[PDB]
Design a protein around this motif. Structure first.
Motif, PDB file in Angstrom:
ATOM      1  N   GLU F  16       0.814  -1.211   0.000  1.00  0.00           N
ATOM      2  CA  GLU F  16       0.000   0.000   0.000  1.00  0.00           C
ATOM      3  C   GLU F  16       0.849   1.263   0.000  1.00  0.00           C
ATOM      4  N   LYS F  17       1.961   1.273   0.735  1.00  0.00           N
ATOM      5  CA  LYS F  17       2.857   2.422   0.681  1.00  0.00           C
ATOM      6  C   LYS F  17       3.370   2.637  -0.734  1.00  0.00           C
ATOM      7  N   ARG F  18       3.785   1.557  -1.398  1.00  0.00           N
ATOM      8  CA  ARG F  18       4.257   1.698  -2.770  1.00  0.00           C
ATOM      9  C   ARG F  18       3.145   2.155  -3.706  1.00  0.00           C
ATOM     10  N   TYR F  19       1.933   1.616  -3.539  1.00  0.00           N
ATOM     11  CA  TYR F  19       0.786   2.064  -4.326  1.00  0.00           C
ATOM     12  C   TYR F  19       0.568   3.559  -4.170  1.00  0.00           C
ATOM     13  N   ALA F  20       0.577   4.040  -2.928  1.00  0.00           N
ATOM     14  CA  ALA F  20       0.314   5.451  -2.683  1.00  0.00           C
ATOM     15  C   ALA F  20       1.380   6.327  -3.318  1.00  0.00           C
ATOM     16  N   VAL F  21       2.650   5.941  -3.193  1.00  0.00           N
ATOM     17  CA  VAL F  21       3.712   6.728  -3.815  1.00  0.00           C
ATOM     18  C   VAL F  21       3.521   6.780  -5.326  1.00  0.00           C
ATOM     19  N   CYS F  22       3.206   5.636  -5.938  1.00  0.00           N
ATOM     20  CA  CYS F  22       3.024   5.599  -7.386  1.00  0.00           C
ATOM     21  C   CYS F  22       1.864   6.483  -7.825  1.00  0.00           C
ATOM     22  N   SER F  23       0.697   6.310  -7.204  1.00  0.00           N
ATOM     23  CA  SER F  23      -0.468   7.119  -7.542  1.00  0.00           C
ATOM     24  C   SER F  23      -0.273   8.586  -7.198  1.00  0.00           C
ATOM     25  N   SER F  24       0.692   8.909  -6.345  1.00  0.00           N
ATOM     26  CA  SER F  24       0.973  10.305  -6.054  1.00  0.00           C
ATOM     27  C   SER F  24       1.864  10.933  -7.119  1.00  0.00           C
ATOM     28  N   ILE F  25       2.826  10.178  -7.656  1.00  0.00           N
ATOM     29  CA  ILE F  25       3.632  10.706  -8.760  1.00  0.00           C
ATOM     30  C   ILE F  25       2.756  10.991  -9.976  1.00  0.00           C
ATOM     31  N   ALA F  26       1.780  10.124 -10.243  1.00  0.00           N
ATOM     32  CA  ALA F  26       0.926  10.308 -11.413  1.00  0.00           C
ATOM     33  C   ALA F  26       0.119  11.598 -11.322  1.00  0.00           C
ATOM     34  N   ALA F  27      -0.364  11.937 -10.127  1.00  0.00           N
ATOM     35  CA  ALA F  27      -1.097  13.181  -9.942  1.00  0.00           C
ATOM     36  C   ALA F  27      -0.224  14.410 -10.147  1.00  0.00           C
TER      37      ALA F  27
END
Ligand SMILES: [Mg+2]
Ligand SMILES: [Mg+2]
Ligand SMILES: [Mg+2]
Ligand SMILES: [Mg+2]
Ligand SMILES: [Mg+2]
Ligand SMILES: [Mg+2]
Ligand SMILES: [Mg+2]
Ligand SMILES: [Mg+2]
Ligand SMILES: [Mg+2]
Ligand SMILES: [Mg+2]
Ligand SMILES: [Mg+2]
Ligand SMILES: [Mg+2]
Ligand SMILES: [Mg+2]
Ligand SMILES: [Mg+2]
Ligand SMILES: [Mg+2]
Ligand SMILES: [Mg+2]
Lengths: 186, 147, 125, 121, 47, 52, 52
Positions: F16-27
């Motif tokens: 989940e931490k990795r998911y959040a970081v990834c979806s944050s770079i996309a934004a």
RNA sequence: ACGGACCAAGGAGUCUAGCAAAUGUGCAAGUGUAUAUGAUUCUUUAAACAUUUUAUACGCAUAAUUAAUGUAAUAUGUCCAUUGUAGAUUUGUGGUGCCCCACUUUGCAUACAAUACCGGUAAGCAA
RNA sequence: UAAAGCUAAAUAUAUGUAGGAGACCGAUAGCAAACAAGUACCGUGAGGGAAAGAUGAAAUAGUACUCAGGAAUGAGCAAUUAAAUAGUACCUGAAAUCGUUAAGAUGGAACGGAUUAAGAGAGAAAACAAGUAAAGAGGGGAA
């Protein structure tokens, strides 16, 4: 005054909205609500309802059971409102076309290696607006372990419910009330 | 969070949800598992039937490392191979795999399921069950005992 | 008592005072719901304080209008009152309490140019 | 393919630096984004949601004409200097062909209202 | 899909780079918020 | 009385931490979202904004 | 450029995250109203109806 | 029947362990990077980042049953996936207005039953 | 391989001393103690144990002079300060309780709910007039 029950007001007994906050799921709900309303098809109504249910009513489906359900339906599309998972117990897989809310990585690899394809629901809205040649499927909804404790209490005659115990062995709830030699069985 | 706690809803009411006539007194039925067999008997009997009494033989110094034994059914036996390696054994009919389940952490081979017809396989293990060994012999394989 | 001027109708004008607030001065007049057996206000005896209820609610079409027949928006500086240039016949402005005289003069002279009315354009003068 | 206008509405309905609502005088909520002709908080009027837009603001003392015309995420904000009614009419012809007349006269009336504001020095 | 590379004087364009595929992750504000309100507890100090 | 063994921290799933970081770079690559966080980037050319 | 080696498009020892897969979406194209306006969908819709 | 001469400030379902149900999230026959170690981590940072350059740390789950020695889930004729009644969805004709009917095709979830097999116990036979 | 002996490191630290910090408390809170606090005071003794912070930027500006009075104290045509209704019982200065002036009511309690009337205080943001012509003072935008 007037002698009515639940005075003049009608009762409904279920979930009414999404609880989840995934924006993509909210877009899906909007799309299939529109489709359900403007073409009352009984195919889009059911789908619009199913993707509102909680997690426990969207169980996974295995690859082997999916292939078994589609044995007499070649060149058709299976529609599942859950995840589909791999099954090591199968030796070989056929060519299938399946739309599902989620696929696991191994299941997705196995499906595409046999010449099949995986679909999301927004593509199925674009290609089969009223669900022609599509088969709705569900997984086993009463296979969860929590459902093994429900029903009659463990202790009522001839029940099947599991008890809640620290651990399992000859020393953990096996003496009086589960054998004839200590005063009665169940 | 204290923000969402149920008690904040009863903040103006007198009894805090516990009733005028039967108050919230402290331990009005005993402590812990106190009254079972006397006045908690029904709860014990209908939710935990076999609770009282003892049965069986004592084992004075167990040492569980002597009887550790994980198992595997013959269902999951071809799935240990990768799909590409699983593939070539189908076409070619002259060669069979030899599988050592003790390299994967399994000890005893157990016999639920179905093997593919006329697809031989050779298995190594410490223990076998009778049905499993028969099913391996039927499709043209062999069982080997190790230690 | 019903009060009506134009299309705006008010279903009552008196406040709902708290029970016993005229007799004990540790009891403040802000309304609190009476709980507790034997009240005579909770049981709706005639001749005592009335209780508020959803039946006194106002018309949706005239729920927040002032006698000016406009809605009120409170501004703190010049840049906040620029969204009013598109809806000037339905809104009126009021200046916040903690802004200085120099700021007030500018706010007033811009409201005059925009043809929007000011509710309290007499303070600090 | 992971973003669209409807997804930008979902993400910015509530949390935003441009929304302003009135606590006293309960009615109304305004969107002040720079490309919003009206000040409504709807998907059909916010510059963040729409692909192509036009507007007139002040932004410093003077009046400014703005175009978005962002076709394929190659967002191209152009900024002009409105000078009088005729120049604005020319600019609408040059850069706002995608709009309708009902929108054009709305923007013209807005510009007329803006041209009566001034201050000292 | 590419992107220009600007020089450190802010006027010249000196290259182009293909956009990495991590920029195509679905954008999930609910997940980001929920994950953030747990990780931010870890730097607190006792009292 | 407050105590020191109140649970101060949390443990978070690694995926989940990795998911959040990834979806944050996309934004970070969508122009409208950066504008809606309060950044004054009206004059910028591209929002991913690579530099030499 | 490091951002493609970190996430496994290009593999490299002691830089790429080990066995990490980049998350996927439950939706293919989130533009709902482009779907609603397609000829196929519009040919299945039903005549607008009246209120009371 | 008991408490209340008056006013201001204070004043009462909380914290930790352990279990369950409900719901949201991630991955899925697996899942959780324990204690540690690493890093061109070091105001913040007591945070965040990483995992040992056909891959056996541990927990819960993937198999039950018996006091116990122990034993352990159709069976090789076919990779096939036990049987019936009602039943969502699909296929082909006709009726009245995409909907509902009369046949036709397929038969999810689940409810009611049947059958086969595994562990313990009786019965019969038993080197 | 008992009935003799020695031996670092990885572990602990509600004490003493020094250093650094916090989604902690803010003078009935926080240590009992923010002040000559284990102090004043109580008990034969073992022991018990408080209350109490704030003028002003500057007193190197802390109230000079005059009149009345035995004195305290008051008053001023007189005096420091931006300010003394900031004068050392000194920032702000609520309620209970009391004084002064005005306006009302008043045959063995008082106050209240509903509904109006008679007095009194305050008020223009809907509770009328765009525009037109003349003159006077200003502030902007284009060419
Ligand atoms: Mg009625
Ligand atoms: Mg109640
Ligand atoms: Mg009580
Ligand atoms: Mg009122
Ligand atoms: Mg009663
Ligand atoms: Mg009593
Ligand atoms: Mg008394
Ligand atoms: Mg749960
Ligand atoms: Mg355990
Ligand atoms: Mg046997
Ligand atoms: Mg013999
Ligand atoms: Mg020795
Ligand atoms: Mg400190
Ligand atoms: Mg104190
Ligand atoms: Mg001060
Ligand atoms: Mg008398």
């Amino acid at each position: 005054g007037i002698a009515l029950k639940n005075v003049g007001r009608i009762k409904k007994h279920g979930r009414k909205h999404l609880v989840s906050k995934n924006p993509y799921l909210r877009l899906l709900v909007k799309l299939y609500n529109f489709l359900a309303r403007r073409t009352n098809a009984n195919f889009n109504k059911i789908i619009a309802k199913r993707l509102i249910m909680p997690k426990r009513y969207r169980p996974p489906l295995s690859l082997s059971k999916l292939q078994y359900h589609m044995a007499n339906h070649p060149n058709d599309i299976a529609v599942v409102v859950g995840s589909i998972t791999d099954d090591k117990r199968l030796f070989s897989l056929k060519q299938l076309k399946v739309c599902a809310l989620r696929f696991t990585e191994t299941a997705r690899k196995r499906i595409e290696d046999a010449g099949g394809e995986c679909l999301t629901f927004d593509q199925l809205a674009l290609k089969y607006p009223t669900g022609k040649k599509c088969v709705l499927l569900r997984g086993p909804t009463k296979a969860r372990t929590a459902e093994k404790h429900f029903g009659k209490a463990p202790g009522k005659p001839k029940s099947k419910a599991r008890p809640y115990v620290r651990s399992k062995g000859r020393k953990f709830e096996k003496a009086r009330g589960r054998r004839k030699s200590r005063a009665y069985k169940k | 969070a204290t923000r969402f706690k149920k008690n904040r809803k009863k903040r103006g009411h007198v009894s805090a949800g516990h009733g005028r006539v039967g108050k919230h007194r402290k331990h009005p039925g005993g402590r812990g598992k106190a009254g079972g067999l006397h006045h908690m008997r029904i709860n014990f009997d209908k939710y935990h039937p076999g609770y009282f009494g003892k049965v069986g033989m004592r084992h004075l110094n167990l040492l569980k490392n002597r009887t550790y034994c994980p198992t595997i059914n013959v269902d999951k036996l071809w799935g240990l191979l990768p799909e590409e390696k699983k593939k070539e054994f189908s076409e070619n009919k002259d060669i069979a795999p030899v599988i050592d389940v003790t390299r994967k952490g399994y000890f005893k081979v157990l016999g639920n399921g179905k093997l593919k017809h006329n697809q031989p396989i050779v298995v190594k293990a410490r223990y076998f069950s009778s049905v499993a060994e028969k099913k391996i012999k039927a499709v043209g394989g062999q069982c080997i005992l190790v230690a | 008592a019903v009060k009506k001027v134009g299309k705006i109708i008010k279903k009552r004008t008196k406040k709902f005072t708290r029970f016993q607030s005229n007799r004990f001065m540790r009891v403040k007049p802000a309304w609190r719901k009476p709980r507790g057996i034997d009240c005579r206000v909770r049981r709706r005896y005639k001749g005592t304080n009335l209780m508020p209820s959803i039946g006194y609610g106002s018309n949706k079409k005239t729920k927040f209008l002032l006698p000016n027949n406009k809605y009120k928006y409170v501004v703190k500086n010049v840049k906040e009152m620029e969204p009013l240039i598109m809806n000037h016949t339905k809104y009126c402005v009021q200046i916040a309490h903690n802004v200085s005289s120099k700021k007030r003069k500018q706010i007033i002279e811009r409201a005059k140019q925009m043809n929007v009315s000011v509710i309290n354009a007499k303070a600090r003068l | 393919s992971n973003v669209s206008n409807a997804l930008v509405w979902e993400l910015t309905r509530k949390s935003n630096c441009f929304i302003k609502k009135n606590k006293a005088g309960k009615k109304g909520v305004f969107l002040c984004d720079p490309l919003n002709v009206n000040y409504k908080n709807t998907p059909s009027s916010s510059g963040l949601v729409k692909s192509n837009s036009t507007n007139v603001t002040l932004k410093d003392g003077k009046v400014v004409f703005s175009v978005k015309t962002s076709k394929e995420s190659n967002v191209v904000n152009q900024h002009f200097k409105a000078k009088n009614m005729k120049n604005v009419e020319k600019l609408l012809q040059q850069h706002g062909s995608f709009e309708k007349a009902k929108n054009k006269e709305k923007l013209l009336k807005k510009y007329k209202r803006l041209s009566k504001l001034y201050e000292t020095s | 899909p590419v992107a220009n590379v600007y020089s450190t004087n802010g006027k010249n364009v000196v290259g182009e780079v293909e956009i990495p595929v991590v920029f195509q992750t679905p954008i999930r504000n609910d997940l980001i918020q929920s994950v953030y309100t747990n990780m931010s507890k870890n730097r607190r100090h006792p009292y | 009385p407050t105590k020191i063994w109140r649970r101060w921290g949390r443990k978070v799933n690694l995926k989940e931490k990795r998911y959040a970081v990834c979806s944050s770079i996309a934004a970070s690559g969508v122009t409208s979202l950066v504008l809606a966080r309060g950044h004054r980037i009206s004059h910028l050319k591209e929002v991913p904004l690579v530099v030499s | 450029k490091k951002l493609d080696v970190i996430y496994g498009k290009i593999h490299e020892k002691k830089v790429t995250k080990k066995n990490y897969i980049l998350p996927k979406s439950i939706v293919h194209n989130p533009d709902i109203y482009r779907i609603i306006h397609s000829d196929k969908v519009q040919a299945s819709l039903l005549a607008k109806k009246k209120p009371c």
